[PDB]
Amino acid sequence: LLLECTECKRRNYATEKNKRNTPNKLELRKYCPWCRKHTVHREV
Amino acid sequence: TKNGRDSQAKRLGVKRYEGQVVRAGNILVRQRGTRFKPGKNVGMGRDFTLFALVDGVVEFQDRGRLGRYVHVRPLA
Amino acid sequence: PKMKTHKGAKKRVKITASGKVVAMKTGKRHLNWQKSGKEIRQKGRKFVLAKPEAERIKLLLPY
Amino acid sequence: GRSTTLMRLPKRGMQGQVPGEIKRPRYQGVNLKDLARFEGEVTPELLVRAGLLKKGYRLKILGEGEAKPLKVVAHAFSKSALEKLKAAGGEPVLLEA
RNA sequence: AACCUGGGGAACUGAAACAUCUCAGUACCCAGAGGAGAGGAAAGAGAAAUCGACUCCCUGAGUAGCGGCGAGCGAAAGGGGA
RNA sequence: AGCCAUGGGGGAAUCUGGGCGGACCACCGCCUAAGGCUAAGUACUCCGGGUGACCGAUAGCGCACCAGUACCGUGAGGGAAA
RNA sequence: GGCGUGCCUAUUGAAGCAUGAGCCGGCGACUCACGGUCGUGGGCGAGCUUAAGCCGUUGAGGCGGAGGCGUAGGGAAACCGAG
RNA sequence: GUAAGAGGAGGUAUAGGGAGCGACGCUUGCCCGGUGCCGGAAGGUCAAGGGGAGGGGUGCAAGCCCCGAACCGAAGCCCCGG
RNA sequence: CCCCGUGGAGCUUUACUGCAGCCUGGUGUUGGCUCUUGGUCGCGCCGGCGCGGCUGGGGGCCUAACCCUCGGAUGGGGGGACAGCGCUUGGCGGGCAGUUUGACUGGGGCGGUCGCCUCCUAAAAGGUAACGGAGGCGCCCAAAGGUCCCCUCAGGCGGGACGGAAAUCCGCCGGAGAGCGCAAGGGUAGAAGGGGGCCUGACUGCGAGGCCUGCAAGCCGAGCAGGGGCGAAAGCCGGGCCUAGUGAACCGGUGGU
Ligand SMILES: [Mg+2]
Ligand SMILES: [Mg+2]
Ligand SMILES: [Mg+2]
Ligand SMILES: [Mg+2]
Ligand SMILES: [Mg+2]
Ligand SMILES: [Mg+2]
Ligand SMILES: [Mg+2]
Ligand SMILES: [Mg+2]
Ligand SMILES: [Mg+2]
Ligand SMILES: [Mg+2]
Ligand SMILES: [Mg+2]
Ligand SMILES: [Mg+2]
Ligand SMILES: [Mg+2]
Ligand SMILES: [Mg+2]
Ligand SMILES: [Mg+2]
Ligand SMILES: [Mg+2]
Ligand SMILES: [Mg+2]
Ligand SMILES: [Mg+2]
Ligand SMILES: [Mg+2]
Ligand SMILES: [Mg+2]
Ligand SMILES: [Mg+2]
Ligand SMILES: [Mg+2]
Ligand SMILES: [Mg+2]
Ligand SMILES: [Mg+2]
Ligand SMILES: [Mg+2]
Ligand SMILES: [Mg+2]
Ligand SMILES: [Mg+2]
Ligand SMILES: [Mg+2]
Ligand SMILES: [Mg+2]
Ligand SMILES: [Mg+2]
Ligand SMILES: [Mg+2]
Ligand SMILES: [Mg+2]
Ligand SMILES: [Mg+2]
Ligand SMILES: [Mg+2]
Ligand SMILES: [Mg+2]
Ligand SMILES: [Mg+2]
Ligand SMILES: [Mg+2]
Ligand SMILES: [Mg+2]
Ligand SMILES: [Mg+2]
Ligand SMILES: [Mg+2]
Ligand SMILES: [Mg+2]
Ligand SMILES: [Mg+2]
Ligand SMILES: [Mg+2]
Ligand SMILES: [Mg+2]
Ligand SMILES: [Mg+2]
Ligand SMILES: [Mg+2]
Ligand SMILES: [Mg+2]
Ligand SMILES: [Mg+2]
Ligand SMILES: [Mg+2]
Ligand SMILES: [Mg+2]
Ligand SMILES: [Mg+2]
Ligand SMILES: [Mg+2]
Ligand SMILES: [Mg+2]
Ligand SMILES: [Mg+2]
Ligand SMILES: [Mg+2]
Ligand SMILES: [Mg+2]
Ligand SMILES: [Mg+2]
Ligand SMILES: [Mg+2]
Ligand SMILES: [Mg+2]
Ligand SMILES: [Mg+2]
Ligand SMILES: [Mg+2]
Ligand SMILES: [Mg+2]
Ligand SMILES: [Mg+2]
Ligand SMILES: [Mg+2]
Ligand SMILES: [Mg+2]
Ligand SMILES: [Mg+2]
Ligand SMILES: [Mg+2]
Ligand SMILES: [Mg+2]
Ligand SMILES: [Mg+2]
Ligand SMILES: [Mg+2]
Ligand SMILES: [Mg+2]
Ligand SMILES: [Mg+2]
Ligand SMILES: [Mg+2]
Ligand SMILES: [Mg+2]
Ligand SMILES: [Mg+2]
Ligand SMILES: [Mg+2]
Ligand SMILES: [Mg+2]
Ligand SMILES: [Mg+2]
Ligand SMILES: [Mg+2]
Ligand SMILES: [Mg+2]
Ligand SMILES: [Mg+2]
Ligand SMILES: [Mg+2]
Ligand SMILES: [Mg+2]
Ligand SMILES: [Mg+2]
Ligand SMILES: [Mg+2]
Ligand SMILES: [Mg+2]
């Protein structure tokens, strides 16, 4: 499935793949942006 | 029929042999599993590729029980 | 009478001051999805051609 | 005989636009190593008047070689070449109006 | 005879099929003009507070661009001339 | 996707007028549409002449000769030999 | 007396029962223009070169720098520059 | 036939066009789900156009300019029956 | 005849795309009066009555455009703002036009196949063909991933309330015949397998050097920097034991500097 992560209060995406009906409605895994470094990532 | 199908050749094997100079990174051996093992100055990667970790000559160790290893004996 | 430059190539290939022919790497516009950071990072840059490189130059002409 | 080796791909962002080329002041790089070639007051008029300019609307002196102490008018200089000569003579800059 | 201008206007062919595109506003048909014909004294150029009708040659330039951005097509201003 | 042109529909103003400067707007600037004429530079070669590292009768024009003939086709038209 | 399977073409292979040709004479097929790219003979050299055209000549050349190639690259670009 | 027009026909449903069968005798069965045709003032979708909530670009503004929801909009198709 | 050529042409259709034709909405040609439903602005009057321009729709009537016709008519009669024609909208449209309608192939057709992975064929490097012999792929996982820690199978025999051919349990033998998501293979417990605790490196910026290779592509990869994760730490992490799980370029979608 097409899942494109997004940075909070900013603008930066990421390579992903959510799963269909499988237990996964919202994802909140960490990462590492360009501007500054390390910030929580919500789905959307 | 229902046959005549196949997957392209994967060209794997010992790439450097015992007593060849090699630079760092040189793929030493490409392999189906751990038909060989790393060892001295010799790393290995996702596929099981073994590769020099410093320039130097290669050598092959048999160790029975423990399996076969490959190393670079460095020098400069 | 005066060969015309091949615009298609102009539009996608530079001929370097020494004489090389540079292009953008293929494979980085939608096969894309999950491909290692490495994968698509590596696709980011230009490369150098070979025998077609000579074919290439033949078009880019008054160019 | 097949799908050509234009498998490669236009990067040349800004290929065109209907009315196309946008007139805009272009600068001709001339080194102050080919400047040493003489003595006086080097100016756009001169470098083109004979040698290494050629109607390229704008003179920009720069780069390699050693700067002969003298006036050298131009439309722009190199951070590096400004030095070279500023450390031995006059750097007078382009027009304005 | 050919040259010219206006009205009309193909296809083979190229694209290694083909339909857009190309061939080509060509071949040809028609009307008219004439020793030529057209064009012609800016409701212009296009970036310089610049040029100064029109036509022709050189150049600009295979550039700017156009293009199933394929095959291909392909200017102008400016500069040198008549 | 402006500019020029215009088949259909709506439809102004006369210099506080209009048009253009590549959607559009503001600025700046350019030009004055909806009447007409204008030589030269240019194109061509039936015609006359001059010249050829152009032909020399299977060549050169189809024709050096009584050839657009003889002959062939209802015809458009084809078209020699010498 | 010894020896000896036409010519061309086309073919894995032709004397070939494969193609073409009665014979002779004459006609008969890799050109030129522009632009590319190598090589080569030469002129000049960080330069080199003129196009139309004008003047000359009437198998004489010269003028003509507009312009082109080169002297800086890198970037999509702004830009920066021996980087 | 682009048109003007002509043929139909200087005819008028006992006529004219199309289609199939093919003197004459006896006859011609069932299946409208699909296709065609015919019918169906409802409904559904449906283009230009009308409409203009709402949003935009620009200007100091008056404005200029663009995008655009509901809603109205034929035939056709859907649907309903023969 | 037969095949072949990305040759031709005639024919067909619910092949593709047009074109004629035909149907159609708006609009120009295009006018008058009247009745009634909806809108519209001002006023009189407590969402409704009266009025005019504007109307949009629908009904009716008119005549003078336009059309037909009448012993030639600046007219009479019939039709009538319709039709016809112009522009434009969408439809139906082999009547017609241009074309398309793959390759392999012990001839072609029919059948089958077409990319990727595994094994054999393959002759002990690599690579090898056949309409040779056999099987898979077009996914799956946020726990099936990172790291720290911990434990080790299948099976055979003996024993156990249901159940014993095989649940779960104790014992003894048991080096791997299990497991490792899925095919096959190579690898593997001195873990890559089972269980836990914390976690998201299924990172950004790169990339010495190689494998492989006609090209394009594919593959491996130390290390540098940035900022992180688990660990006391040495260290390990740029997804998953590995090898399939895919698609140049154009054109376009969304979000950003
Ligand atoms: Mg095979
Ligand atoms: Mg690693
Ligand atoms: Mg791994
Ligand atoms: Mg890893
Ligand atoms: Mg060179
Ligand atoms: Mg990047
Ligand atoms: Mg050039
Ligand atoms: Mg192909
Ligand atoms: Mg002509
Ligand atoms: Mg073709
Ligand atoms: Mg072809
Ligand atoms: Mg061809
Ligand atoms: Mg014409
Ligand atoms: Mg005349
Ligand atoms: Mg004259
Ligand atoms: Mg004249
Ligand atoms: Mg005239
Ligand atoms: Mg005037
Ligand atoms: Mg004019
Ligand atoms: Mg002046
Ligand atoms: Mg294409
Ligand atoms: Mg053209
Ligand atoms: Mg002259
Ligand atoms: Mg002249
Ligand atoms: Mg404008
Ligand atoms: Mg008009
Ligand atoms: Mg402008
Ligand atoms: Mg203004
Ligand atoms: Mg003459
Ligand atoms: Mg003559
Ligand atoms: Mg003759
Ligand atoms: Mg003779
Ligand atoms: Mg003659
Ligand atoms: Mg006769
Ligand atoms: Mg014989
Ligand atoms: Mg023979
Ligand atoms: Mg033959
Ligand atoms: Mg012969
Ligand atoms: Mg014979
Ligand atoms: Mg040449
Ligand atoms: Mg009649
Ligand atoms: Mg009639
Ligand atoms: Mg009649
Ligand atoms: Mg009759
Ligand atoms: Mg009967
Ligand atoms: Mg029956
Ligand atoms: Mg009802
Ligand atoms: Mg609003
Ligand atoms: Mg505003
Ligand atoms: Mg404002
Ligand atoms: Mg307002
Ligand atoms: Mg409404
Ligand atoms: Mg309808
Ligand atoms: Mg309807
Ligand atoms: Mg072919
Ligand atoms: Mg064909
Ligand atoms: Mg009313
Ligand atoms: Mg009405
Ligand atoms: Mg009415
Ligand atoms: Mg009436
Ligand atoms: Mg009447
Ligand atoms: Mg009446
Ligand atoms: Mg009258
Ligand atoms: Mg009536
Ligand atoms: Mg064709
Ligand atoms: Mg075939
Ligand atoms: Mg067969
Ligand atoms: Mg088949
Ligand atoms: Mg093998
Ligand atoms: Mg082998
Ligand atoms: Mg190899
Ligand atoms: Mg081989
Ligand atoms: Mg679990
Ligand atoms: Mg699990
Ligand atoms: Mg038991
Ligand atoms: Mg864990
Ligand atoms: Mg490398
Ligand atoms: Mg590499
Ligand atoms: Mg690393
Ligand atoms: Mg670090
Ligand atoms: Mg830190
Ligand atoms: Mg590791
Ligand atoms: Mg694991
Ligand atoms: Mg394409
Ligand atoms: Mg496209
Ligand atoms: Mg899209």
Side-chain angles (χ1 to χ4, degrees):
Chain A
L1 185 152
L2 291 327
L3 205 281
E4 60 233 322
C5 282
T6 182
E7 194 178 10
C8 304
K9 287 286 186 178
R10 281 185 192 175
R11 37 215 69 193
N12 188 271
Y13 301 101
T15 67
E16 277 281 43
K17 177 185 69 179
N18 208 15
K19 331 305 174 181
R20 194 68 186 274
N21 220 164
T22 329
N24 234 327
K25 296 290 161 298
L26 62 304
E27 190 157 304
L28 57 166
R29 268 63 184 179
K30 196 198 288 181
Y31 208 64
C32 177
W34 213 198
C35 294
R36 267 71 179 261
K37 290 286 185 177
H38 273 262
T39 41
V40 293
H41 266 92
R42 281 301 179 180
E43 194 164 329
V44 178
Chain B
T1 73
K2 34 192 40 179
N3 287 325
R5 179 187 11 275
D6 199 11
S7 65
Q8 74 133 3
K10 299 309 187 61
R11 272 144 252 267
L12 37 68
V14 192
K15 293 320 192 184
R16 285 315 195 273
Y17 290 135
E18 180 164 89
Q20 275 161 47
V21 198
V22 343
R23 304 240 271 134
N26 289 225
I27 306 291
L28 297 170
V29 139
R30 281 199 168 258
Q31 53 172 348
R32 321 180 179 178
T34 48
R35 303 184 52 76
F36 286 61
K37 305 210 181 188
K40 297 165 194 161
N41 298 314
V42 167
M44 121 171 170
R46 300 218 311 96
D47 54 9
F48 293 142
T49 284
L50 310 172
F51 61 100
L53 267 163
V54 269
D55 12 34
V57 183
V58 162
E59 65 182 338
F60 287 98
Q61 184 150 155
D62 189 19
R63 296 242 278 163
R65 316 309 173 99
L66 317 150
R68 317 159 67 174
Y69 296 69
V70 194
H71 336 258
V72 185
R73 61 188 180 193
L75 44 129
Chain C
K2 293 182 65 121
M3 24 197 314
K4 298 175 159 188
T5 73
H6 187 317
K7 299 288 169 164
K10 220 270 80 192
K11 291 173 196 307
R12 73 182 86 189
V13 164
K14 162 165 187 174
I15 171 172
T16 74
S18 106
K20 308 184 191 190
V21 162
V22 185
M24 285 303 305
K25 261 275 182 170
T26 48
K28 189 199 72 287
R29 203 25 82 81
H30 80 27
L31 73 173
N32 203 148
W33 84 282
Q34 198 83 23
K35 284 166 64 64
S36 69
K38 172 185 155 190
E39 277 283 18
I40 110 165
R41 174 179 323 103
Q42 290 244 78
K43 299 297 185 47
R45 55 177 185 173
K46 312 169 194 277
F47 56 110
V48 164
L49 287 179
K51 312 327 186 79
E53 179 157 314
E55 270 199 9
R56 205 80 323 85
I57 301 191
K58 285 306 185 157
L59 334 183
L60 310 185
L61 239 217
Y63 253 97
Chain D
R2 85 219 140 192
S3 140
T4 157
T5 204
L6 96 199
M7 278 174 58
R8 19 72 193 224
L9 35 270
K11 199 212 194 319
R12 280 32 176 172
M14 257 126 305
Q15 65 166 79
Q17 213 79 224
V18 196
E21 200 44 38
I22 20 58
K23 201 80 166 171
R24 67 155 61 112
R26 315 149 309 182
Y27 290 79
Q28 159 97 137
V30 40
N31 269 246
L32 69 203
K33 72 172 285 299
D34 257 330
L35 237 29
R37 179 151 77 182
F38 48 144
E39 250 288 349
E41 194 183 27
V42 296
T43 76
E45 158 68 315
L46 253 57
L47 293 311
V48 62
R49 166 169 292 274
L52 16 60
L53 205 288
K54 260 54 167 69
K55 333 288 184 136
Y57 198 61
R58 243 54 129 60
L59 199 174
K60 175 173 185 155
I61 344 65
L62 46 69
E64 295 208 357
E66 309 280 13
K68 268 45 189 170
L70 88 182
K71 252 188 175 60
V72 48
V73 128
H75 303 87
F77 295 78
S78 185
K79 287 35 162 186
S80 150
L82 206 286
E83 316 299 59
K84 287 287 185 187
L85 73 83
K86 192 205 203 83
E91 67 107 320
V93 99
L94 50 25
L95 65 291
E96 195 73 355

